[PDB]
Amino acid sequence: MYVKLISSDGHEFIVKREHALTSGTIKAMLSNEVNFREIPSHVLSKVCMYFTYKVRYTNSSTEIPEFPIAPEIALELLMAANFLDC
C-alpha cells in the first residue's frame, strides 16, 4: 500500500505504492523501502509531488494546471527525472 523512499540526506518519504510505481526505475527497485544515494530531499520531495500530480490529472477533462518548478531546483530535478524515467 505505502512505500518508503529515502533521500541522499536521510529524510524519509512515505507515499502510495501506485504513485511510486509511476517511475519504472522505482518499479524495478521493488522486485518495501528504497534509498537514493544521489537525490537530496529538496529534489525528492518534488518528485513525489509530481507523482501525486501525475496521478491526479492523468485522464482528466477539466483543465489541468502547470506543474511549477523553481529555478534553483530545475537542474537537480532534471537529473532525477532522467534517472527515474518519469
Partner: protein
C-alpha cells in the same frame, strides 16, 4: 496526413484552457503545417473551418505540444459550433524539466551547465511540428 478538401463550412470554437499563448496549426491540403493567429491563455475565438480539416495545437513561444479534446488531432465534424478545448497535457517530469531549463537559458550556453552529455542533446532537441508529424504519420 492532410486536410480533406470538402468545401463544407464548419464552425469551430477554440477555447484555450492552458496558461500558454496557443498557436493553432492547420494542415493544408498537401500536408504542410499552416499557422494561424495566436490565442491568449484565458481566451476563446470562433473559427470558420470545414468538415474533415486537421488541426493541432502548440505553445506559441516554444512549440511544446498541447492536447485538444484529449487527443492530439482535432477534426471539425447538428446545430452550431464544435468545441476545441485546448489543455496542457501531463508532461513527463523530464520533459517538464527540459522546458523550464530551455526557457531559462540561451541555447548557446547549454554546453556549460554541468550535466550528462545525453542531457545536452535532449535540451537541444526542441519540440517541433515537423518531427511530431512524423511520429504521428506512422501510427
Amino acid at each position: 496526413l492532410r486536410s480533406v478538401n470538402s468545401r463544407e463550412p464548419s464552425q469551430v470554437i477554440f477555447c484555450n484552457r492552458s496558461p500558454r499563448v496557443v498557436l493553432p496549426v492547420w494542415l493544408n491540403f498537401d500536408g504542410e503545417p499552416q499557422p494561424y493567429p495566436t490565442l491568449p491563455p484565458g481566451t476563446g475565438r470562433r473559427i470558420h473551418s470545414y468538415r474533415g480539416h486537421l488541426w493541432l495545437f502548440r505553445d506559441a513561444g516554444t512549440h511544446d505540444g498541447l492536447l485538444v479534446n484529449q487527443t492530439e488531432l482535432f477534426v471539425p465534424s447538428d446545430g452550431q459550433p464544435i468545441f476545441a478545448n485546448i489543455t496542457l497535457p501531463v508532461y513527463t517530469l523530464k520533459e517538464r524539466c527540459l522546458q523550464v531549463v530551455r526557457s531559462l537559458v540561451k541555447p548557446e550556453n547549454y554546453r556549460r551547465l554541468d550535466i550528462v552529455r545525453s542531457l545536452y542533446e535532449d535540451l537541444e532537441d526542441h519540440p517541433n511540428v515537423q518531427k511530431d508529424l512524423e511520429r504521428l504519420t506512422q501510427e
